[PDB]
């Protein structure tokens, strides 16, 4: 298993370009079955699951090829299933679902787990195609979908929040005849900026971004080109990088407006902050940060995937901080590694405490969280020493050539393969 052995400490400073949004990019390269006309898809980064998605979209018969854009041609998809070899590695797959039942009247994904009563993630995006029409059922291993004719729109009420089912409720109801209405939405940037990928295709989506999306059904979609979004994430891990390290960077190609609780948190740590159309500035003028408070919440909140960043923030911070999980109240994996590393605090029940301490020192560590491996090997950038971070390919598979990006801010790390 590859690692990367970083020594410290080090000052992170000067320039990053933020890739676009993985997170964005998969439910565009999905809603892109539904154009009967070529699309151009701008700042697409070059990650694990692209590539799988490009081969499941080509198993379907669509046209595919990429450089940093993806270009699709799906006027000519003619095979409605997705196989358990092309989607084993990949549970976003069943995107491919909505779009096909919604354009074909048909379609058919290879799901894991067989038939179950319990409760699971993909049956949200079954209830929402079910809520539009389409008749479902699992057997030889797949879920099947169908619905003679087109998809019904319908006034859907979501439980919770959920990114997944809302992309596959808003694609495929862009086709569907009628109005669609979908309350309590997914509210996060990606959505919205699925959402305008479908209008640039010809779709009528308004409330994107807020809890109630309104689309209107339309005979067909034609095909464009449209530029996925930053990686917000990506954004807030080098923003932090700076301010834990008393650097000063410049992030190119970002988006401010996804980040606004983000930000105004980093401010409330002592970065000197500025803003423009599509970059962002972090001063900590050689200043240690101040700890704060972070609360996850659902987006516009503070993001639980900029928490583990922020935990390392506060442990290296002056005074004390309290960093409390409402999304995902047992991700604190992190906390253990960087106790090993010299930090000190207290995990109580979704919440840390935190003491800042002046230096870390390095350790073998481990994470198997993206963000929490990420956050390691920031520590390792400013912790005394060497420090070896295990099992990187989590952070291969979400982040795009961040050994590279670390190095141009100064970062002394290598990957070590083999054993
Ligand atoms: C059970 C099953 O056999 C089937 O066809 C459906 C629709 C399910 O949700 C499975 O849990
Ligand atoms: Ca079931
Ligand atoms: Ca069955």
Same mark, same amino acid.
């Given at each position: 298993?590859?690692?990367? %052995?970083?020594?410290?400490?080090?000052?992170?400073?000067?320039?990053?370009?933020?890739?676009?949004? +993985?997170?964005?990019?998969?439910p565009?390269?999905?809603?892109?079955?539904?154009?009967? &006309?070529?699309?151009?898809?701008?700042?697409?980064?070059? /990650?694990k699951? @692209?590539?799988?998605?490009?081969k499941l979209?080509?198993?379907?018969?669509?046209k595919?090829?990429?450089?940093?854009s993806?270009?699709?041609?799906?006027?000519?998809?003619?095979?409605?299933?997705?196989?358990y070899?092309l989607?084993?590695?990949?549970?976003?797959?069943?995107?491919?679902?909505?779009?096909?039942?919604?354009?074909?009247?048909?379609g058919?994904?290879?799901?894991?787990?067989?038939?179950a009563?319990?409760?699971?993630?993909?049956?949200?995006?079954?209830?929402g /195609? &079910?809520?539009?029409?389409?008749?479902?059922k699992?057997?030889?291993?797949?879920?099947?979908?169908?619905?003679?004719? %087109?998809?019904?729109?319908?006034?859907?009420?979501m439980?919770?929040?959920?990114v997944?089912?809302?992309?596959?409720?808003?694609?495929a109801?862009?086709?569907?005849?009628?109005?669609?209405?979908?309350?309590?939405?997914?509210?996060?940037?990606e959505?919205?900026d699925?959402?305008?990928?479908?209008?640039?295709l010809?779709? +009528?989506?308004s409330?994107?971004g807020?809890?109630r999306?309104?689309?209107?059904?339309?005979?067909?979609?034609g095909?464009?080109?449209? %530029?996925?979004?930053?990686?917000?994430?990506?954004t807030?891990?080098?923003?932090?990088a700076?301010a834990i390290?008393?650097?000063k960077?410049?992030?190119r190609? =970002?988006?401010?407006?996804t980040?606004?609780?983000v930000?105004?948190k980093?401010?409330?740590?002592?970065?000197?902050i500025?803003?423009?159309?599509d970059?962002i500035?972090?001063? !900590?003028?050689?200043?240690?940060?101040?700890a704060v408070?972070? %609360? $996850?919440?659902?987006?516009?909140?503070?993001? $639980?995937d900029?928490?583990?960043?922020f935990? /390392?923030?506060?442990?290296?911070?002056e005074?004390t901080?309290? @960093?409390?999980?409402t @999304?995902?109240?047992?991700?604190? !994996?992190?906390?253990?590694?960087?106790?090993?590393?010299?930090?000190?605090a &207290? @995990?109580?029940?979704? $919440?840390?405490?935190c003491?800042?301490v002046?230096?870390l020192?390095?350790?073998?560590?481990?994470? $198997?969280?993206?963000? =929490?491996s990420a956050?390691?090997?920031?520590?390792?950038?400013?912790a005394?020493?060497?420090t070896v971070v295990?099992?990187?390919?989590?952070?291969?598979?979400?982040?795009?050539?961040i050994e590279?990006?670390?190095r141009?801010?100064?970062?002394?790390?290598?990957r070590?393969?083999?054993?």
């Amino acid at each position: 298993m590859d690692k990367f %052995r970083v020594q410290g400490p080090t000052r992170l400073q000067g320039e990053v370009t933020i890739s676009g949004a +993985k997170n964005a990019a998969l439910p565009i390269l999905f809603a892109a079955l539904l154009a009967e &006309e070529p699309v151009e898809i701008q700042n697409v980064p070059k /990650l694990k699951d @692209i590539d799988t998605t490009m081969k499941l979209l080509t198993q379907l018969g669509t046209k595919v090829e990429r450089x940093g854009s993806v270009w699709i041609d799906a006027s000519n998809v003619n095979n409605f299933s997705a196989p358990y070899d092309l989607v084993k590695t990949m549970r976003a797959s069943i995107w491919a679902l909505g779009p096909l039942v919604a354009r074909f009247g048909q379609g058919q994904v290879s799901l894991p787990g067989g038939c179950a009563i319990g409760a699971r993630p993909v049956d949200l995006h079954i209830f929402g /195609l &079910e809520k539009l029409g389409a008749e479902i059922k699992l057997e030889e291993g797949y879920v099947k979908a169908s619905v003679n004719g %087109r998809l019904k729109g319908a006034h859907i009420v979501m439980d919770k929040v959920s990114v997944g089912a809302t992309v596959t409720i808003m694609s495929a109801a862009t086709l569907a005849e009628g109005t669609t209405i979908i309350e309590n939405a997914a509210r996060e940037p990606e959505i919205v900026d699925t959402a305008n990928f479908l209008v640039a295709l010809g779709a +009528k989506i308004s409330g994107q971004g807020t809890d109630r999306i309104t689309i209107e059904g339309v005979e067909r979609l034609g095909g464009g080109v449209y %530029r996925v979004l930053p990686d917000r994430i990506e954004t807030g891990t080098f923003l932090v990088a700076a301010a834990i390290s008393g650097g000063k960077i410049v992030c190119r190609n =970002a988006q401010p407006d996804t980040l606004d609780a983000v930000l105004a948190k980093l401010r409330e740590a002592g970065a000197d902050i500025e803003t423009g159309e599509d970059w962002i500035s972090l001063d !900590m003028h050689g200043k240690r940060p101040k700890a704060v408070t972070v %609360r $996850t919440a659902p987006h516009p909140a503070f993001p $639980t995937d900029m928490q583990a960043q922020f935990t /390392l923030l506060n442990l290296v911070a002056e005074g004390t901080g309290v @960093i409390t999980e409402t @999304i995902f109240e047992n991700r604190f !994996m992190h906390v253990p590694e960087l106790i090993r590393m010299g930090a000190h605090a &207290e @995990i109580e029940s979704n $919440t840390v405490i935190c003491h800042g301490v002046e230096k870390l020192s390095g350790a073998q560590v481990m994470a $198997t969280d993206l963000r =929490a491996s990420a956050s390691l090997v920031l520590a390792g950038c400013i912790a005394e020493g060497t420090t070896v971070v295990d099992r990187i390919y989590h952070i291969d598979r979400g982040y795009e050539r961040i050994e590279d990006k670390l190095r141009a801010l100064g970062a002394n790390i290598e990957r070590v393969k083999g054993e």
